[PDB]
Amino acid sequence: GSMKFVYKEEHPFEKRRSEGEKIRKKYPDRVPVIVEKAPKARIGDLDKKKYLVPSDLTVGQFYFLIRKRIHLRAEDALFFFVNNVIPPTSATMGQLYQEHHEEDFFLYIAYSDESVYGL
Amino acid sequence: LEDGWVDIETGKE
Ligand SMILES: [Cl-]
Ligand SMILES: [Cl-]
Protein backbone atom coordinates (compact mmCIF):
# COMPACT_ATOMS: atom_id res chain seq x y z
CA GLY A 1 0.00 0.00 0.00
CA SER A 2 3.13 2.12 0.26
CA MET A 3 6.73 1.59 -0.83
CA LYS A 4 9.07 -0.19 1.58
CA PHE A 5 12.79 -0.63 0.88
CA VAL A 6 14.85 -3.00 3.02
CA TYR A 7 17.93 -1.19 1.67
CA LYS A 8 17.07 1.95 3.64
CA GLU A 9 16.80 -0.02 6.88
CA GLU A 10 20.08 -1.82 6.22
CA HIS A 11 22.02 1.41 5.51
CA PRO A 12 21.32 4.42 7.77
CA PHE A 13 20.46 7.66 5.99
CA GLU A 14 23.68 9.53 6.65
CA LYS A 15 25.71 6.66 5.20
CA ARG A 16 23.45 6.43 2.17
CA ARG A 17 23.65 10.16 1.50
CA SER A 18 27.44 10.22 1.75
CA GLU A 19 27.62 7.39 -0.78
CA GLY A 20 25.07 9.10 -3.02
CA GLU A 21 27.13 12.30 -2.99
CA LYS A 22 30.24 10.40 -4.01
CA ILE A 23 28.65 8.23 -6.68
CA ARG A 24 26.91 11.20 -8.35
CA LYS A 25 30.25 12.99 -8.66
CA LYS A 26 32.16 9.90 -9.87
CA TYR A 27 29.56 8.83 -12.46
CA PRO A 28 27.74 12.04 -13.36
CA ASP A 29 26.05 10.73 -16.54
CA ARG A 30 24.61 7.80 -14.57
CA VAL A 31 21.80 7.65 -12.06
CA PRO A 32 22.19 5.42 -8.98
CA VAL A 33 19.16 3.16 -8.65
CA ILE A 34 18.26 0.83 -5.79
CA VAL A 35 16.04 -1.99 -7.13
CA GLU A 36 14.03 -4.26 -4.83
CA LYS A 37 11.19 -6.70 -5.24
CA ALA A 38 7.88 -5.41 -3.96
CA PRO A 39 6.52 -7.27 -0.93
CA LYS A 40 4.14 -10.11 -1.87
CA ALA A 41 5.67 -10.48 -5.36
CA ARG A 42 6.13 -14.03 -6.65
CA ILE A 43 9.31 -13.24 -8.56
CA GLY A 44 12.51 -13.66 -6.58
CA ASP A 45 15.06 -11.13 -5.37
CA LEU A 46 17.89 -9.79 -7.50
CA ASP A 47 21.36 -10.91 -6.47
CA LYS A 48 22.40 -7.24 -6.42
CA LYS A 49 20.34 -4.13 -5.74
CA LYS A 50 22.68 -1.26 -6.66
CA TYR A 51 22.68 -0.20 -10.32
CA LEU A 52 24.28 2.68 -12.19
CA VAL A 53 22.06 3.58 -15.14
CA PRO A 54 23.03 5.87 -18.06
CA SER A 55 20.69 8.85 -17.85
CA ASP A 56 19.68 8.58 -21.53
CA LEU A 57 18.18 5.09 -21.22
CA THR A 58 14.42 5.00 -21.40
CA VAL A 59 12.35 3.55 -18.60
CA GLY A 60 11.33 0.81 -21.05
CA GLN A 61 14.98 -0.05 -21.72
CA PHE A 62 15.55 -0.22 -17.95
CA TYR A 63 12.57 -2.58 -17.61
CA PHE A 64 14.16 -5.01 -20.07
CA LEU A 65 17.61 -4.94 -18.46
CA ILE A 66 16.19 -5.70 -15.01
CA ARG A 67 14.11 -8.50 -16.55
CA LYS A 68 17.30 -10.10 -17.87
CA ARG A 69 18.89 -9.97 -14.42
CA ILE A 70 15.93 -11.79 -12.85
CA HIS A 71 16.25 -14.38 -15.64
CA LEU A 72 12.51 -13.82 -15.87
CA ARG A 73 10.52 -15.88 -18.35
CA ALA A 74 9.17 -13.80 -21.21
CA GLU A 75 5.60 -14.86 -20.37
CA ASP A 76 5.85 -13.54 -16.79
CA ALA A 77 4.69 -9.93 -16.58
CA LEU A 78 6.72 -7.36 -14.63
CA PHE A 79 5.67 -3.92 -13.33
CA PHE A 80 7.77 -1.20 -11.70
CA PHE A 81 6.85 1.37 -9.05
CA VAL A 82 8.50 4.59 -7.92
CA ASN A 83 6.98 6.63 -5.09
CA ASN A 84 3.80 4.50 -5.36
CA VAL A 85 3.19 5.13 -9.09
CA ILE A 86 4.14 3.29 -12.26
CA PRO A 87 6.64 5.56 -14.07
CA PRO A 88 6.03 6.97 -17.55
CA THR A 89 7.40 4.82 -20.34
CA SER A 90 8.63 7.74 -22.45
CA ALA A 91 10.77 9.18 -19.68
CA THR A 92 14.48 8.73 -19.59
CA MET A 93 15.99 7.42 -16.38
CA GLY A 94 17.64 10.82 -15.98
CA GLN A 95 14.21 12.45 -16.10
CA LEU A 96 12.82 9.90 -13.65
CA TYR A 97 15.74 10.61 -11.34
CA GLN A 98 15.14 14.37 -11.53
CA GLU A 99 11.56 13.95 -10.39
CA HIS A 100 11.83 11.10 -7.91
CA HIS A 101 15.30 10.89 -6.34
CA GLU A 102 15.41 10.80 -2.55
CA GLU A 103 17.53 12.88 -0.17
CA ASP A 104 20.30 10.30 -0.18
CA PHE A 105 20.58 11.03 -3.92
CA PHE A 106 19.42 7.54 -4.91
CA LEU A 107 16.37 6.61 -6.96
CA TYR A 108 14.32 3.73 -5.51
CA ILE A 109 12.38 1.44 -7.84
CA ALA A 110 10.39 -1.66 -6.90
CA TYR A 111 9.30 -4.48 -9.19
CA SER A 112 6.43 -6.95 -9.03
CA ASP A 113 4.53 -9.50 -11.07
CA GLU A 114 1.36 -7.58 -10.10
CA SER A 115 0.18 -4.24 -11.45
CA VAL A 116 -0.64 -3.22 -7.85
CA TYR A 117 2.38 -2.80 -5.57
CA GLY A 118 0.77 -4.15 -2.41
CA LEU A 119 -0.74 -7.31 -3.90
CA LEU B 1 32.24 -0.42 -10.53
CA GLU B 2 33.19 1.14 -7.21
CA ASP B 3 31.30 0.46 -3.96
CA GLY B 4 29.34 -2.59 -5.19
CA TRP B 5 27.57 -0.75 -8.00
CA VAL B 6 26.77 -2.61 -11.23
CA ASP B 7 26.79 -0.72 -14.52
CA ILE B 8 23.46 -1.97 -15.82
CA GLU B 9 24.15 -2.22 -19.57
CA THR B 10 27.60 -3.83 -19.43
CA GLY B 11 27.43 -5.59 -16.08
CA LYS B 12 30.74 -4.04 -15.04
CA GLU B 13 31.14 -3.97 -11.29
CL1 LIG C 1 20.20 -4.36 1.29
CL1 LIG D 1 29.00 8.44 -15.89
Author numbering:
A (entry chain A): -1 to 117
B (entry chain B): 1 to 13
Quote the study that presented this structure, word for word.
Here we introduce RFpeptides, a denoising diffusion-based pipeline for designing macrocyclic binders against protein targets of interest. We tested 20 or fewer designed macrocycles against each of four diverse proteins and obtained binders with medium to high affinity against all targets. X-ray structures for macrocycle-bound myeloid cell leukemia 1, γ-aminobutyric acid type A receptor-associated protein and RbtA complexes match closely with the computational models, with a Cα root-mean-square deviation < 1.5 Å to the design models. RFpeptides is not limited to generating macrocycles with particular motifs or topologies; the diffusion process generates macrocycles with diverse shapes and sizes and selects the topologies appropriate for the protein being targeted. Among the four targets tested here, binders for MCL1 and MDM2 have helical motifs, binders for GABARAP have a β-sheet topology and binders for RbtA sample looplike conformations that make extensive contacts with the flat surface of this target.
We selected γ-aminobutyric acid type A receptor-associated (GABARAP) as the target, a protein responsible for mediating autophagy through its role in autophagosome biogenesis and recruitment of cargo, resulting in lysosomal degradation of damaged or surplus proteins and organelles. For designing macrocyclic binders against the human GABARAP, we used a similar pipeline for MCL1 and MDM2 but we doubled the number of generated designs and defined six hotspot residues (Lys46, Lys48, Tyr49, Leu50, Phe60 and Leu63) to guide the macrocycle backbone generation to a specific site on the target. Two designs, GAB_D8 and GAB_D23, showed binding affinities of 6 nM and 36 nM, respectively. GAB_D8 and GAB_D23 demonstrated a half-maximal inhibitory concentration (IC50) of 0.7 nM and 2.5 nM in the AlphaScreen assay, respectively. GAB_D23 crystallized readily with GABARAP and also closely matched the design model with a Cα r.m.s.d. of 1.7 Å when aligned by the target and Cα r.m.s.d. of 0.74 Å across the macrocycle alone. The X-ray crystal structure confirmed the key designed interactions, such as Trp5 and Ile8, with the main difference between the design model and the X-ray structure being the switch from a type I β-turn from Leu1 to Gly4 in the design model to a less regular conformation in the crystal structure, with a tendency for a type I′ β-turn from Glu2 to Trp5. While our original design models were predicted with single sequences as inputs to AF2, we retrospectively predicted the GAB_D8–GABARAPL1 and GAB_D23–GABARAP complex structures with multiple-sequence alignment (MSA) inputs. These MSA-based predictions of the designs matched even more closely with the X-ray crystal structures, with a Cα r.m.s.d. of 0.5 Å and 0.9 Å for the GAB_D8–GABARAPL1 and GAB_D23–GABARAP complexes, respectively, when aligned by the target structure.
